[model samples]
Target: REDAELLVTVRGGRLRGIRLKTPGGPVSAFLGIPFAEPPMGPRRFLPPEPKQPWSGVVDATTFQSVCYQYVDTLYPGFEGTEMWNPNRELSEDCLYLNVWTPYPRPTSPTPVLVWIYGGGFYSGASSLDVYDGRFLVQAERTVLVSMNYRVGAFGFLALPGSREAPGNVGLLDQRLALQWVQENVAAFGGDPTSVTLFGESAGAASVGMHLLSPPSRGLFHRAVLQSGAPNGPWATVGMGEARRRATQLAHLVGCPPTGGNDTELVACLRTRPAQVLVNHEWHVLPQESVFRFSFVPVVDGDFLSDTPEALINAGDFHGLQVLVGVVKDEGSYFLVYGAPGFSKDNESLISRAEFLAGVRVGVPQVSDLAAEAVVLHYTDWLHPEDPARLREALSDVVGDHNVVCPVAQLAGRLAAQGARVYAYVFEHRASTLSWPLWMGVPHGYEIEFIFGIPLDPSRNYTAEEKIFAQRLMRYWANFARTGDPNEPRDPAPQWPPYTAGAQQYVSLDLRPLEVRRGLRAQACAFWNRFLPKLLSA
Candidate 1:
């Protein structure tokens, strides 16, 4: 039967997977397989340990529990479309990985694409329906792997000179998962040397961190950063700041700080229930007023020896191939929830003073003069009279500063160093969404097309969208197989490598996908050139 169970033996033990018939061929799915030991008891907040071997075949047919997160509580009204969560079961024992392949045991190893999910570095699971790799595995003839890692305070909490809680446990979890793939992915018909790590938002930031990390240097050959980088302001926190947050979190949870004994504090925290730690109001941490995220990776002395920007500037990262881009309106997603005064129905033009305040809200580190300059540049000193128009203009400014400029800066830096970089601006607006046109394409809009999964079944895609999705899949799959996104056999537009002078990127849109130049040249120049001078001064 086409639905027969398949088996494969790895370093740990034998696992039973399920095979299903697909249009491309029969694809085998091995879901909910443990790649690392459960982070319970002593392992909590510590680095992931190796998985223990089992004697007989273990069931790997269903998705396992996800890491503890406040999805339902965190995003009260957030539902439908992109922020969908299917894994209702959550626990600390959530370090599992899933694999999809066209062959259970192949005569040749296929290229592997390992996806890391993004939820502001706090909430996400690998079991989301949109993240399903059936279509990609069937069509691309490549192995796909998705992994679940710890998040929030559990993932990143730094203390003074403590090896157990030195921060970046989530990154360490991913490193362990990559190590697992390097050892066991061959059993699932995947090439260890050709693995490409890719993700969206904070996940993209995770990929970027892995790129800069000394431990993760050789784990993956290539990376695709959807909309984030390690250099993004929100991606990394200062060691002192992270430690302060950890102390604050401990006090909030009724566990007094152990003065300087981080080990004692961690032990006290471990005794508490997972829900107590997960449900605690962590928004009280410093910087929550501007950036809502509480726990994030810190520059630990071991795993991350230096800041991502410093490392990149010093040429510490590998000259690996990279595909990086940002959605046209990435900041709109943040404005929807994070920003208070900015809303669609508010119908109020942000005054020059309010605009300056908002700039400080998102980018608190910006110099006061630079913030005022931003307001002047965006408003042209003469703000639009119409409120909706004014809000739209300001939203564009936020999107560029928060997502576009940062990604562009990284892409330019990578290109300047002679690294192969292919950049793109995802401008395709899926016809399914009910969002206003003024919002443009929000942060997560491009992921559905990237995964070849539209938002909903009732929302039929236009002919252009179908062709675009197909081509998008082709370009991504070709990149997975070879380093380049373009193939000689395909008829799509030739995607040129990005450079400082060329600055060319694919404008991923409807039919007639055109190659574009100078994405937001004026605003990017203001942010990348003059803003740095102001900050340094």
Candidate 2:
């Protein structure tokens, strides 16, 4: 009975959690508590609504169903290994969240961190073992929470006007969950006013959007953006583009074109089964569109009045203390999956010409001169036989273009606004996976260390890796407790605040952790200053 005995009451009703004994102490895990009404039937495509309260105690020991999504089985190599969701339990009734707390009943309220998972806005779930909060709770001695929101067509399809298919429901789902936390987390020994919004990839980008969202102003106190921001090229689209994609998807699923009736399209989509909607390939734009990601958050004109970059330039984002970062090779796995002509066997190296073409493919709006400049900067024609050298060089181009430069640019903008910003670059090679060390730190590799969970438990982690994990946990937990990452637990390196000219950042790795200055300074400048003018030209 000890395992099933832990209980906590939230807004809806009394709930039970599972008790697990660990080295630190006993921790309680409350899983699969619904935060909103099921986004199915009539609620499809609409923003989330608060869950109706129940009278009796509800069992929260097991994870609820994950939102239905197509498994990313299309790519091979490390691409396939990135962000796999093995949860077979899927449904439209997936607006649920889980919590892990070290204190069953705390005299003082603890800080909370809400995690949002990312899969290019097409796939992902909160139920993955990599996202487990057991160790994080024990190690940090703070409450950890993760939520499930809709993905793919079910989450982001948009129509004209505010009446129907207004777009950004997935983001809305996250917003509502945060509101639920603010209203109810105190009962579970969490400080409602001290919540930190943190996530990876699309999840991080969602955090960026929340900073820009008017309704999200007072919902969270801090933010941690890992490898993304709302201004990332793939994060948001315009209203016209969003509707075009929605119409194209409607036709693909056998629904007649809206014929200018956006409401009719919404009605048709609502009538379809979740399987039918998720099975078809959906695009944020067209198949041959410049941007790679499909089914992402769009500037719905309400939730997002303008682009995040534009809003930030106009001083329209929430001013909160922030910690943001990206992996060393943020675009390596992404390039392997997206670039068809590129080879993973290390036998065939992409030519300089091929590299320029690929750039044009990813950013079609880029000028020919700018694409040539990018190719010239990243090309390594002297060592075609050395695939590692070639791939590393090329991956730098894609990484900077897609994630690296974008993240740095966002940090610079946030810092310019007088917000305290701590920037980091995750360079820790994953010792657990069989991934080649030559690839460096690919996207999402630092997640296991951040969560203090070994992604591949079958393989033993080195002693250095164990220490690295501890350091990361301390830094993250310290930031959650206080806005600053400096702590009394260890005399670790002091992480300085980022500024426009200082460009200071912490480089996370197995080596000595220290604050470095001007991370990718020259490369980021090229992309941020020179490239944007080219694309707009």
Candidate 3:
């Protein structure tokens, strides 16, 4: 039979994974496998301990509970965001990892690709339909793994100098999972030595953050960051700010302050029900704008001794090969709500006044002159009244500040540090994507194409999408194999690594592959160089 039950015994225990048949080939998937012990009670907000081996066979056929998060329909794409939340239930006992491998197991050790989901560092899971890797594994001869790490206060609460309540438990959860892969991935016919870690949004930010992390440095040989980075706005905070937010949440929940005793606050938080903690997050953390998330990673003395910018500047990172880039219109996903007066229905022209007004409001960190500099940089003197074209520039500026420039600048930083980096700008907007076309491959649109979703006959994917999906996976898995995205054989286009001197990248638009140089050279310099200096001065 083409389909048969697959069993693999790792360091933890024997697991029964199910076989799934795809158009390309049959693949095996092991889901809901615990890599760490449940973090509950006193263990809550503390680092995860490796899960102990079980006595008998464990059923890893389905996904387990996901990290606790509050889902609401208050946002523009609430339905899409809801699709990412756990369908089963939410709990603190969500430290599980899932794996997909070829059914018969490769004759030789296969490259393993590990994924980290992005949810603004508050809500995300591997069980989401878009992240299931069985189809991708069937399409490519590689092993795929994804893990569920804690989010929101359950994982990021920082208590200044308290060992028990030290922050960045979510990052530690990922660190422990990577260690699990190193110890046990061989059972599934994966080479522990050959590993690539990649993620999207906050997940991508985590992938970049791991580069400078002493604990996460050697976890993977290469990294792929999609649409975010460690130093991006809202990605992290100082310990002082983290403590303040934690204190606010404590007081809001009727718990006493730490009072120089961090454990005292930790003890009070432990008694509150999980649901209350998730629900009350809004009450405690105020927003600078709807676009920012406050309860995020902190500069904990352990996971992080310094800011990502400081560490990268000091060359403290692994400096390994990396594949990183962003979509064409990353910030378009934010227009409906993040920016006022720009919605699916509103097509009004962004007058010169509106453009200047938006730039000042969106980028409020730097001096007023710096905002004017951004305004002058994106000015469209000719046909500035063109609604569609003007709208494009408005979102373009927002997209650059929020994600585009951050990723581009990070790629440059890695390249400057002598890390081999392959960069690309994904421009193909999948016909199947339900979002407005004006959004033009917003934020994570490349995820479906990379994961081989277009290869499925069940979906209404176009022939154009299928072709790009094949090429996308080829480059991604190829990088996981040899740190290069190009093939020795002909037909696959060449993708040169982004070097400090030459900052070229691929521009993928579903047909006739072409290369582009200097990912927004002027804009990135403005964002990464001038703005920071402006803020500092």
Candidate 4:
């Protein structure tokens, strides 16, 4: 109906046509392009390889097969959720990238936004209807991309027999996809040098890892993380822990203990049936799997050096413009699903390690301290029961440590190196979710705005919604274009760069506002007294 284009993609060195949809008038595309060989059989768990060149015109009008994964109730009433309920059709050979751009521009290189979807490392696909980046691309005049990497057990399993292959197969797949973009995105009309990597939840965590990985250095220039943190059990857990979990799973499936060299171990796994390999549950996120233990990205001191929080503290993420934050109430879903034993009490917020020790620990251990600090700071303008008061308390205990705290610390550290940083607190909640909704701006809701897709009732935009959406689009577009969010038509808050004497940030919500004219003394005080000692070691 608009425009059509054909392109060639390679799988195991063979040429295949990948169809792409190119709408007329303005939007153009190169969809379903393969960035790696089919990751089945011997290729499973291995780092992705670049697609070899091909001769003929390759059709790229449609999306390719998604990696075999089991979805859960993350997206209520969504088709993918149904598929995971019964464990039905899923394919193993799923590694594709889709791009959307404005065509025929005289500009040779346009900024690119490479998005990664998240589902606790269990399930999610680039084919989701909500991820249509057309609105963002068309409105901002930039290039957008989404890639599919292996998920669940297939992508993160760390069996003892497969020791040679590090645990984060999913992460490895992502790296290869970025490499593909760096090499070929120019042909699709993108500037690889000006790439900005962004994601939500698991995807955001991946951006943190990329920042720490030597291989990912210079792969992306700017970064945005929405509603996710870099350091948790998976990111900081040692390799020994990863190996033990892998060995247990290996024994359950009768694979030989992974004592041999890398190739030998990988060979043993290659022979296993694809379904047999991935059919088992992975327990990275609670609802995603029923297994007590789940495989996650392993710290092999190779691809990634250390946990992102520690790396940031060591001044590792210097010279990078950053935007990071979490939504109001991310844990609402865990409660909604009736997860094993969730409550508003200490146990609900504490991790297994803390509970077993009979010691309230991590971020929740210091909730009182944070809540008090917040109350003290806003005492002049607000009361104890105000929404901002609740948000401030939540931000200190969970928000700061998980998203803002680490982000702020990283920004502060990077500020010494002359990097600009911005922070926001999303307070816009969906009307469908009334008081006691618990799911204040629930996790992953911001994707509705960034991708310019219809809002989930939880994040519905008001009549003035377009103004907010348009403003957000401009901020994001400008960030991708010039490493800054302030644009001519839409100026931003007097966002004091992270390097300024007193650190400052902007709160992004129904109304974007400036903050920290004299150091968010209250928030930072809470972190100093409780966070560094209690949560992030």
Return the top candidate by lDDT: 3
Model 4: residues >4 Å from true position, as ranges?
1-25, 73-89, 159-164, 233-236, 257-279, 283-293, 316-318, 337-401, 431-436, 455-462, 489-493, 499-501, 512-537
RMSD versus native structure for model 1: 2.6
Candidate 3: deviation at residue 451, Å? 0.4
At residue 8, what lDDT does model 4 achieve?
27
Clashing pairs in 1: none
TM-scores, each model vs. reference: 0.93, 0.93, 0.93, 0.77
Please report the candidate that would top TM-score against the real structure: 3
Candidate 1 residue lDDT tens string, 83-153: 55536488899999999988545669899999999887778899887787877787788889999999887
Clashing residue pairs, backbone N/CA/C < 3 A, model 2: none
CA lDDT of each candidate?
0.78, 0.78, 0.82, 0.61
TM-score of decoy 4:
0.77
Candidate 4 lDDT for residue 12: 27
Candidate 4 lDDT over 260-349, as tens digits, reads 454655576667676665555552222331212265676666666766656666754447887765666654443423333343232244
TM accuracy, model 1: 0.93
Sliding window of 10 residues with minimal summed lDDT for model 4: 353-362
Better of 2 and 4 by TM-score: 2
RMSD of 3: 2.6
